[PDB]
Structure 1
Amino acid sequence: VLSPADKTNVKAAWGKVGAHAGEYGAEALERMFLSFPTTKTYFPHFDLSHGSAQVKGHGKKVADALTNAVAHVDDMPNALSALSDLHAHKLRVDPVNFKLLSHCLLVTLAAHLPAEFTPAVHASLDKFLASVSTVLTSKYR
């Protein structure tokens, strides 16, 4: 549950990604694939090699949904309705994976926003990523 310090903090960090959110969506995917190889069973159709176009474009898709969750921090459920549906009924990623990719988004952020990735910004993003994960998997059954 995001408190007002939480949303403020996510609004801030996120603001600084700006223009690189896609660059970062893609390396978050690239850290995951390599640190958690099992995550790869969902992209058997993608080239997963370094600097693949598929991954890169996928990086942006995802980045943009994150962005769109930042903006609608108070109405995720509605901001993300279409997407939970997509994940619950078509993709069916096992819920446990949401946490492996959240964690790679954290690392990536940490590594690119050293001044702002403070303990409380860290704690905030974490709770963030956790509630978008909860919203994606909310219609699984």
Structure 2
Amino acid sequence: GLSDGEWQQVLNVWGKVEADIAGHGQEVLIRLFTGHPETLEKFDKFKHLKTEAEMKASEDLKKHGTVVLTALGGILKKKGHHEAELKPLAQSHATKHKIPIKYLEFISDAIIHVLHSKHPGDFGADAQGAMTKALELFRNDIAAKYKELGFQ
């Protein structure tokens, strides 16, 4: 339930991310892992990352960041018509990776934080409002699939 104006703000902000998808992806995941170390335990391949320096130096972490933000970008460009894109991610995250919805809230908050940090004074109040609604829409739509699967 975003307006046309709100979707336009979302995809304008997303333009910023696309100019450096790997840099943004890395900073999001580092923000998530340092803020919520339980999220790092869900990745067998990042458990070895003890320090933030190790995270920063990890080319594989940056690669995962690219994968995640590429997928999210695809979803956002559907402007809420994203059932086909969400279905497999709900299934993998609930059934295989065992990711509680709470951790999706954590990464949503990390995206907002990273946008301010990399674009200080260039991520206006209207843009934060619109990006927040988009990310809540994503979370709400994943949550419905989690409930269908009985996932906690």
TM-score, length-scaled by structure 1: 0.89
Find the counterpart in structure 2 of residue 89 from structure 1.
95
Find the counterpart in structure 1 of residue 17 from structure 2.
17
Find the aligned partners of 2:143 and 2:97 in 1 and give their Cα distance: 11
Find the counterpart in structure 2 of residue 106 from structure 1.
112
Find the aligned partners of 2:95 and 2:139 in 1 and give their Cα distance: 15
The Cα shift of 1:116 comes to 3.3
* Structure 2 counterparts to residues 20-31 of structure 1, below 5 A: 20-31=20-31
Find the counterpart in structure 1 of residue 42 from structure 2.
42
Secondary structure of the 2:99 match is: coil
Secondary structure of the 1:116 match is: coil
Structure 2: runs of 5 or more not aligned: none
Q: In the alignment, which of 72, 81, 96 is matched to residue 75 of structure 1?
A: 81
User: What one-letter code is carried by the residue in structure 2 that aligns with 1:16?
Assistant: K
**Per-residue displacement from partner, 1:39-77 (whole Å, max 9, x unpaired)?**
222113324332212211110111101110121113122
TM-score, length-scaled by structure 2: 0.83
Secondary structure of the 1:13 match is: helix
Find the aligned partners of 1:112 and 1:67 in 2 and give their Cα distance: 18
In the alignment, structure 1 residue 60 sits paired with structure 2 residue 66:
yes
Larger Rg: 2
Identical aligned residues as a percent: 27
RMSD: 1.7
Find the counterpart in structure 1 of residue 33 from structure 2.
33
Aligned residues: 141
Secondary structure of the 2:104 match is: helix
